[PDB]
């Protein structure tokens, strides 16, 4: 129903082996369109989705200027914190950042954000009212004092409210046949006889999107919530996803167990048993 | 070891964020190369071939679009030799500060902007922002003064710059900064014109 555009920056330092390794990726829902690597022989912005690749040079270049410029900053941001907390000169670190914007099916901003973490540990974050910060510790307070005096919220806000959205509209529009579509999972069940008189049946649901999906097992029509074994959703490696649930069962009585799939690509939830050859 | 070259920046020492500046290194000595080096947060050294022409051996170092890292203290040297580099004595120190990264401070003159000669005047910069130090510059004056801030005091953070017996008028501007990053300054305070009667 509603979509969002999320950016993920990672600034990793390496005291000896060189300089800060900066990486950034951008998604529109479960789809990734941009990638930028500070190490590439040619550090530049790159497309990862059709829609956003349709754009032209000025764009890709204006975007690259931002990435190049970002890193250049995180570089200092790292060297900064390393001091805030007064740490080793040769003691590696990381500064992650997440920011983006959530919208209604009509467009319009629901919630925007922007938050950093130091060494996988919540650092500072732009508050929901898009006008204040929440420093995790004394160190991050320094940041705030500075950022408050620099009006970062005033600006960051404007993007979240202003362009963060507009862009998402634009992306949503051009990639409507992808992002605003569905692509239901191609389902099926595999029969693997485990131990004398027992068999394992997996219900596969692959190549679907978004990754949000639900798989359930029912015996005679009763939820097996308790004995339904299922792996966390993984990427097919081509933009779509996978997942499967399984339950142990008494041979023969297989046909009593039915699988249940609920995805957005499915108008109606799917029910399916194993189909024993012939 | 040769004589130290001369180092100057155009338009000047304080570089506005984004904006660019040029530090030129020159001497009557025919140095084949000039090395510009800044120390501090992110030390670095820039190489450059000398330009011999117009009675001067120079080299103009372009300090890219100003920002955080670029600010600091620079010094250059020249060398007759190539590859190894037979560095000369260090040019005088040049503190390249980056400005305009924070709220403008307010600059005032107690007893007032206008005063009779001899009388004592003192400027003061206050701000709701929590700058730890303030800087006071007088139009075309080489060095800038710098006093520490006065903590949370009913709305602000001050710093008073005594100027003693007023003799010559002048336009002043303040800047605020933070301890950890001393080459990162705020926006200039509206210029204040001090007049002596």
């Amino acid at each position: 129903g509603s979509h969002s555009m999320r950016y993920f920056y990672t600034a990793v330092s390496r005291p000896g082996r060189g300089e800060p390794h900066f990486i950034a990726v951008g998604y529109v829902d479960d789809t990734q369109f941009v990638r930028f690597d500070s190490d590439a022989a040619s550090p530049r912005g790159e497309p990862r989705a059709p829609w956003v690749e349709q754009e032209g040079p000025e764009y890709w270049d204006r975007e690259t200027q931002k990435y190049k410029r970002q890193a250049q900053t995180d570089r200092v941001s790292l060297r900064n914190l390393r001091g805030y907390y007064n740490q080793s000169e040769a003691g590696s670190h990381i500064i992650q950042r997440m920011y983006g914007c959530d919208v209604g099916p009509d467009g319009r901003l629901l919630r925007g954000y922007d938050q950093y973490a130091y060494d996988g540990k919540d650092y500072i974050a732009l508050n929901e009212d898009l006008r204040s910060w929440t420093a995790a510790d004394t160190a991050a307070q320094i940041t705030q004092r500075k950022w408050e005096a620099a009006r970062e919220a005033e600006q960051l806000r404007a993007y979240l409210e202003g362009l963060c959205v507009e862009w998402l509209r634009r992306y949503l529009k051009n990639g409507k046949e992808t992002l605003q579509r569905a692509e239901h999972p191609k389902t099926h069940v595999t029969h693997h006889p485990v131990s004398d008189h027992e068999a394992t049946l997996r219900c596969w649901a692959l190549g679907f999107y978004p990754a949000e999906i639900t798989l359930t097992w029912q015996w005679d029509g009763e939820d097996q919530t308790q004995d339904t074994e299922l792996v966390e959703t993984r990427p097919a490696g081509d933009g779509t996803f996978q997942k499967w649930a399984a339950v142990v069962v008494p041979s023969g009585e297989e046909q009593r167990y039915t699988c249940h799939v609920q995805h957005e690509g499915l108008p109606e939830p799917l029910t399916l048993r194993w189909e024993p050859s012939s | 070891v040769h004589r130290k070259p001369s180092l100057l920046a155009h338009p000047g020492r304080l570089v506005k964020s984004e904006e660019t500046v040029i530090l030129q290194c020159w001497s009557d000595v025919r140095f084949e190369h000039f090395l510009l080096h800044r120390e501090g947060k992110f030390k670095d050294t820039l190489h450059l071939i000398g330009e011999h022409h117009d009675g001067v051996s120079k080299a103009n170092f372009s300090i890219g679009p100003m920002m955080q890292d670029l600010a600091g203290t620079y010094r250059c040297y020249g060398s007759v030799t190539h590859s190894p580099y037979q560095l000369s004595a260090p040019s005088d120190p040049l503190d390249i500060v980056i400005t305009g990264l924070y709220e403008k401070p307010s600059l005032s003159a107690q007893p007032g902007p206008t005063v009779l000669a001899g009388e004592s005047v003192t400027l003061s910069c206050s701000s709701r922002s929590s700058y730890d130090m303030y800087h006071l510059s007088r139009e075309g004056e080489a060095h800038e003064c710098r006093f520490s801030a006065g903590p949370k005091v009913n709305g602000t953070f001050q710093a008073d710059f005594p100027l003693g017996p007023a003799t010559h008028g002048g336009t002043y501007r303040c800047f605020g900064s933070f301890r950890d990053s001393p080459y990162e300054w705020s926006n200039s305070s509206d210029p204040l014109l001090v007049s002596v009667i």
């Binding site: 900053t73 941001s77 | 955080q68």
Partner: peptide
Amino acid sequence: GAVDPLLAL
């Protein structure tokens, strides 16, 4: 569109 980088942390 990525946010415009501002000041250092």
